[PDB]
Amino acid sequence: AESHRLYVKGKHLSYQRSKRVNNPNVSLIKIEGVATPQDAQFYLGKRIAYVYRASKEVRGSKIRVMWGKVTRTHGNSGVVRATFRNNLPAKTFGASVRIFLYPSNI
Amino acid sequence: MAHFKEYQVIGRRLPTESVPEPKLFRMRIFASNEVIAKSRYWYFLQKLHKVKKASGEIVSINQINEAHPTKVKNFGVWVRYDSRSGTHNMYKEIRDVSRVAAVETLYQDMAARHRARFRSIHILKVAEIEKTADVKRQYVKQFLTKDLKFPLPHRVQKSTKTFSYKRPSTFY
């Protein structure tokens, strides 16, 4: 109606990392309203999209998308690890991200 | 040392042709598993008889379950504990539902008040205080008064999200 949204909103927090070294191949996602590991097992394998904007049109859109999937859970607070087709830029720490409901299991 | 169990542990003094069937001593031992309890058994026997695990044998190991696990009991406890400057016997009293629960908070107390790690303490005796007013320690006696009641003032509720829209109330 006014609300068309088919995804859950999310946050790009960090790369996976130690204290002093980070691995960009894994990104750490915060999923709105998922507070525990058990809650976040629902989202494992759902597909994630980071949707940004750009100057050059390409295929007729000025809007581009990096795609990926939730992979495993992270910690006890329901944060989630994910991997993307290409790794996410790290300017996107704290940027918004969308988790779609597919592949669907319900 | 962990969540505790109690163990009857029985061992004897290996047989010799000249002395078959030696004398069979039992101990009750509080341990978190049966491997500690056997080590612990041998620890005390070498403190009393002339034996060591090499020259001796454990005859049997059995867990003892609390006889009335839902009945509240007043326990007196008897402890010998090394401290930094010297070793001292003690008697504390513990009110709880099982000997195992009792021993648990004993060790916790000896750590908090007297800084005694598990290695320093010896349990000398734990036994049920049968008649009341054989309770000798005031922090237990407090809880034996007839028709006891107390409020739990200033109640604090664990919040499940980082923000709250109300403002808490410690009411209860």
Binding site: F93, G94 | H154, T162
Partner: protein, 197 residues
């Protein structure tokens, strides 16, 4: 959850407000803090007075300008507790710090906006009752903050208008509860009940 989150500073422990405020911006959550003069530090006033003076004597010996800067205002006492929890020399940190505003009192627009609270920083929820604590406005006016009186003046005025506001509002939701009563017992109402509403 919301584009901007406004926090009533009043009744919060400085280091536990700063701690959550810091993590929120680093996750991209805008925050504005109001009434930083009603902020609390654990320990009696004298302790945090001395503690501030320890802070106060550190300066660059050859030029006191390059040296550590000492901000007396309760908001800035707070923003310092915060900045230490953010890696503020990274670009990513300057980014996150810019999602922050801290205010003495509740100035315009935020006054008519709703402000929220942080139970894990709430002093009354955390301190053992009977510990001694400090209020930021007392401490700041001690160390040279000039404005405690003007803030308290403006506030008590702002506090009176917001009571007019509230009075009207409690008087309008009195009617709304009344009209909601006639609708009760109707078919719409009874069906919604069964469905949880």
């Amino acid at each position: 959850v919301e584009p901007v989150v406004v926090i009533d500073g009043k009744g919060h422990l400085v280091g536990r407000l700063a701690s959550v405020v810091a993590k929120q911006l680093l996750n991209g959550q805008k925050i504005v803090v109001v009434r930083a003069e009603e902020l609390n530090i654990s320990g009696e006033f004298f302790r945090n007075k001395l503690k501030y003076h320890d802070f106060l004597r550190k300066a660059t010996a050859f030029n006191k300008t390059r040296g550590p800067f000492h901000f007396r205002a309760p908001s800035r006492i707070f923003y310092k507790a915060l900045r230490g929890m953010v890696s503020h020399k990274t670009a990513r940190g300057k980014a996150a710090l810019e999602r922050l505003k801290v205010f003495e009192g509740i100035p315009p627009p935020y006054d008519k906006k709703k402000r929220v609270v942080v139970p894990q920083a709430l002093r009354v929820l955390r301190l053992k009752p009977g510990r001694k604590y400090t209020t930021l406005g007392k401490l700041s006016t001690s160390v040279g903050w000039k404005y405690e009186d003007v803030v308290a003046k403006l506030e008590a005025k702002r506090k009176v208008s917001s009571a007019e506001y509230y009075a009207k509002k409690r008087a309008f939701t009195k009617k709304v509860a009344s009209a909601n009563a006639t609708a009760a017992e109707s078919d719409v109402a009874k069906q919604l009940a069964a469905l949880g509403y």
